[PDB]
Amino acid sequence: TVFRQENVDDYYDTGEELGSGQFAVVKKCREKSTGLQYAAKFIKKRRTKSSRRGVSREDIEREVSILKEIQHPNVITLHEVYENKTDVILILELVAGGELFDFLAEKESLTEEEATEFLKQILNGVYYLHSLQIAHFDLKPENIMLLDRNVPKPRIKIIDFGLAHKIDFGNEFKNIFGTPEFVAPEIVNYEPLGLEADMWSIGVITYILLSGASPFLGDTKQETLANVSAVNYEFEDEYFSNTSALAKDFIRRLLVKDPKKRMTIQDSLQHPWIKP
Ligand SMILES: CN(C)c1cc(-c2ccncc2)c(Cl)nn1
Structure with a gap:
């Protein structure tokens, strides 16, 4: 074209x-x-x-x-x-409210209500994409932008479709690989990819929103990738002692190695922590 x-x-x-x-x-x-x-x-x-x-x-x-x-x-x-x-x-x-990443650095970590306020919009956006059989493949705080950062409940938009792909056959097998901290095990292992990769990313984003900490982050990119593939993460008490069990449940059902056992976008929207 x-x-x-x-x-x-x-x-x-x-x-x-x-x-x-x-x-x-x-x-x-x-x-x-x-x-x-x-x-x-x-x-x-x-x-x-x-x-x-x-x-x-x-x-x-x-x-x-x-x-x-x-x-x-x-x-x-x-x-x-x-x-x-x-x-x-x-x-x-134009989305002029800055990155969710910068907003997060400004607050350290969010309350569960603030986190679900953002998360619900992310889920709605991803529900739309997945409905269209579009995998984003690069979901992370930097690719979430606020329309206005100075309101109590900001509106967000997903950006950067540079890695996005149509998934017409349930999976795609191509040279696809984003930021180590947010990529799913199947990306690390160069396995066929589908919509499920995005759900893992959402789990990572959710962990970050609630704690201000990255769950699989190592000292080097290779160490991060290794941690991801081994599903080497835990909920540190110092950061999660006053986080609800249901919030942890939500994260746990997304950070699952086997893509077939991970929650789908529809399941995430019906999860008790999200479903109002
Ligand atoms: C911050 N990063 C990585 C961005 C931001 C934008 C963008 C900024 C403002 N309004 C719309 C899009 C885009 Cl297009 N691409 N990358």
Whole structure:
């Protein structure tokens, strides 16, 4: 598929950076014709067929295809796509309240009500994606953004569909692998992946939300991955002594090695800690 090749600077003015990654830079922008603001994600393209730098056209097209399909309050929306010889430029909905990651660092850890307030929205967003047979594969606090960080109950949106894939056959067997602290054992072991990987990630996020601590984090990436594969985590009393047994139950049913035995998104929404 080809995208709009007009100079993006002809239709938009850019401003402050809102994110810098390995192969992408995100800048706030304003459309000249409407005055509306967006986030422009500039993704560097591969310069040669077998280059290691940049994102393959195949990967960019998949991301765009998934983004064009989604419309839900808890997921980011794609406005337009531009491209030139060096980059693909995604004009995305602006989410200006910062990362759930930064908010978490500002509070240390959340109460169960605050954690379930965020978690319910994450679950709703993932329920939408899974309903569409879309696995995100990169769920973590950095990829959760608040619309407004200064309200008592912030609204959140899931971002960064860079690793997302359609799962038409129940599983996918490809070069997929995100951040060690949040990836499921099946990712670590290079096994077929499905929607269940996202449910493990949610378990990790939930543990972090309640404690301020990462459950499998080691001193090196390889140690983290090893901990994940062995399901080497525990609820430290120092952090969980006043956490409800039901909250721990929820986490325990997500941090299960066998994907077939892990709670599904539907089960998570019916779990007693979540179900109102
Ligand atoms: C923080 N990281 C990794 C981000 C943030 C954004 C973003 C920022 C603001 N509004 C919408 C999206 C995107 Cl597109 N990609 N990565």
